Amino acid sequence: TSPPIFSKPMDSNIRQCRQKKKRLKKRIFAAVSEGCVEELRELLQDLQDLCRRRRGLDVPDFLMHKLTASDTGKTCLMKALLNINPNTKEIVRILLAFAEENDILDRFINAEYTEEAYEGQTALNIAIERRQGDITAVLIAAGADVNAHAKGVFFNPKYQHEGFYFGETPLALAACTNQPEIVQLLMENEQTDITSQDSRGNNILHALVTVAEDFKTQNDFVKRMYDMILLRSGNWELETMRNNDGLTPLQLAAKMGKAEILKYILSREIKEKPLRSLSRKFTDWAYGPVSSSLYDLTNVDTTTDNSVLEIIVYNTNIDNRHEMLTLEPLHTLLHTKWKKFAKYMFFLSFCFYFFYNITLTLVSYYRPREDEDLPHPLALTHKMSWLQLLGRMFVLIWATCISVKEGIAIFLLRPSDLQSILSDAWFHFVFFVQAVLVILSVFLYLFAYKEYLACLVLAMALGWANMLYYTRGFQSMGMYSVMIQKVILHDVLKFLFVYILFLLGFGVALASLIEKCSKDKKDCSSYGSFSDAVLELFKLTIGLGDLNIQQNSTYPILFLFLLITYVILTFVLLLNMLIALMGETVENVSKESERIWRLQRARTILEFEKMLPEWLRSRFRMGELCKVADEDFRLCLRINEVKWTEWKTHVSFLNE
């Protein structure tokens, strides 16, 4: 979006527009940047000769105070590794030779910035970045600590952009930057503690998830370097370590939205002998096209919180969702729930809520409308032993079940779901106000304010408008509720803005040309008030009003000019762009409507699972226990899938 702002840059080439201490520092920092090799041995010989004319037991502290910048913590060796020259291999040798003779060596190698913006960045981070593996091998031989954590403002941005975040450790920098050979050069060195956490709490595997691309692209160098480090560890320690916000690297993969690393993590099978337990897919038999598989689902099903099925559905800012739902343990565990408990509970809602409106409509439409007997037609009003009184009791007790439950569902809703049609925020607002106006019509009848009938008529209106919610069961009618809502909130709300300006504008312009015919008693014009003349232009938009242009008004030609100017501007011009602008939109819905429906069916599957007791939820608890190795008890989900179109491709290529 917008570029960031950093105060001091990391290394500057351009000069911007005591002295003996100023004489000697800058001549070292400049000469190390172009790499004059003779100039290094001149200054450093005089520098140790300078420090002899200084108090002992404070001579190493004065020595580094020459070598260091004052405002930033950068030393001499850091600028050398930044500014690459052919003369680097000589001056690195001398800067290691000068550190040997004194006690400065351990202080010199592990130097970091003390600057607030770039803190912690050691010399070993700089050698890895510039594609210099051989200076990196010497700094390891010099004894640089490989657990160096560079916590800083620049190394921890608050957004995705405005910074660079890799994991604050030299092993994560090696793997994110497409550098294979440095990784085994660091991992086979036994002093490297792999399992260690940064300021965010991430280990090595969380970082590689955050540097991927969700699209399937040409090269996937964050995917293969994820794999090389995992097998070399050979344990479940890197997989199940959980960060500060309580996510594992599979649960983080669904959170960020990376839809290609996540396809790998489900479908791992390693079939060699010592590396057997790392697999999450187990194939037990195959025969031609047919193959059976046992998926793991230890953290996929909803038996625990923050499951990777719950994260995909209920969370937006995940841009691509439907490409994640079509994965194999995710597609089956929605479809297997649909045939067992979920298709009947959606049917029982449509039976009661359609029998709720028939009981509401007949009560209001056949009510006593005479003043001599005006009961409330609901809630019995009296004691008459009237027929069908299992109905009027049924309206009121179901009106509280809708009011309270959606009133809970209003509150427990994040601000992310308010701004998208993909989320069902809009239906909890329309079912709720239908429950309010019913119980208010009993509440306003009782206190005798006597506006009760207006709220009950609006209750019968929205009571049949919300029957369009239950069309999301079919596929042929499920697209027709989505395609309406992609037309209203996109385009039609841009139409009713501009059309008001032409309605408001000519509304006063025609009202000012008449003198009041209510003084004339004839009511000759229908354009008397502003509220009348606006209405007579609305009938001229649909085609309902009549051009009674024989008019006893001041300047009747100008009154006839503006009516023709109105019809050209808004009947042929604006209303036939709205057909031409909806035509772009409806074709853009029809290609991708089948994806949006399967999401909005997969939201009411997981809601009806949460409305279950614990025994009945565990009655439909899918999966069995398995023993796939020595000392192992895992969960399984047998899928006997068959692949005709893929098997013919594999067997055809093998001969030729």
Q: Which does 614 bind (CB under 5 to 8 A by kind): ligand POV, a copy of itself, none?
A: none
Q: Which of 29, 499, 502, 647 binds ligand POV (CB under 6 A)?
A: 499
Alpha carbon of residue 491 to chain centroid: 25
Of the pair 63, 402, the CB lying nearest ligand POV is at 402
Of the pair 12, 385, the CB lying nearest a copy of itself is at 12
Q: Name residues whose C-beta falls within 8 Å of residue 399's C-beta, 6 or more positions apart in sequence.
A: 435, 438, 439
Residue 532 in the binding site for ligand POV (CB under 6 A) = yes
Q: What are 375's two structure tokens?
A: 């009961």
| Distance of alpha carbon 646 from alpha carbon 654, whole angstroms | 13
Q: Tell me how many degrees the CA angle 155-159-165 measures, rounded to the nearest 5.
A: 30
Q: What are 482's two structure tokens?
A: 């989505």
**Minimum distance from CB of 381 to a copy of itself (Å)?**
18
3-state SS of 91-117? HHHHHHHHHHHCCCHHHHHCCCCCCCC
Do 403 and 414 form a contact (C-beta atoms < 8 A)? no
Q: Tell me how many degrees the CA angle 500-506-509 measures, rounded to the nearest 5.
A: 145
What part of residues 342-371 is at the interface with ligand POV (CB under 6 A)? 344-345, 348-349, 353
Residue 341 in the binding site for ligand POV (CB under 6 A) = yes
Of the pair 89, 340, the CB lying nearest ligand POV is at 340
Residue 544 in the binding site for ligand POV (CB under 6 A) = no
Q: Is 108 exposed, middle or buried (0-12, 13-18, 19+ CB in 10 A)?
A: buried
Q: Which does 611 bind (CB under 5 to 8 A by kind): a copy of itself, ligand POV, none?
A: ligand POV
**Minimum distance from CB of 637 to ligand POV (Å)?**
21
Q: How many residues does the chain have?
A: 656
Q: Name residues whose C-beta falls within 8 Å of residue 40's C-beta, 6 or more positions apart in sequence.
A: 28, 31, 32, 91, 94
What part of residues 391-410 is at the interface with ligand POV (CB under 6 A)? 401-402, 405-406
Of the pair 140, 413, the CB lying nearest ligand POV is at 413
Of the pair 50, 492, the CB lying nearest ligand POV is at 492
Whole-Å CA distances, 475 to 397, 465, 597: 33, 20, 8
Piece of 92-100, 120-128, 515-523, 557-565 that binds ligand POV (CB under 6 A):
557-565
463 is in an annotated binding site: no
Of the pair 298, 541, the CB lying nearest ligand POV is at 541
What part of residues 478-497 is at the interface with ligand POV (CB under 6 A)? 496
Q: Is 438 exposed, middle or buried (0-12, 13-18, 19+ CB in 10 A)?
A: buried
Residue 429 in the binding site for ligand POV (CB under 6 A) = no
Residue 568 in the binding site for ligand POV (CB under 6 A) = yes
Of the pair 424, 491, the CB lying nearest a copy of itself is at 491
Q: Which residues are annotated as a binding site for Na(+)?
A: 543
Name the residues that contact ligand POV, by CB under 6 A: 341, 344-345, 348-349, 353, 401-402, 405-406, 424, 427-428, 431, 496, 499, 531-532, 534-535, 538, 541, 557, 560-561, 564-565, 568, 572, 575, 611-612
Annotated binding site: 543
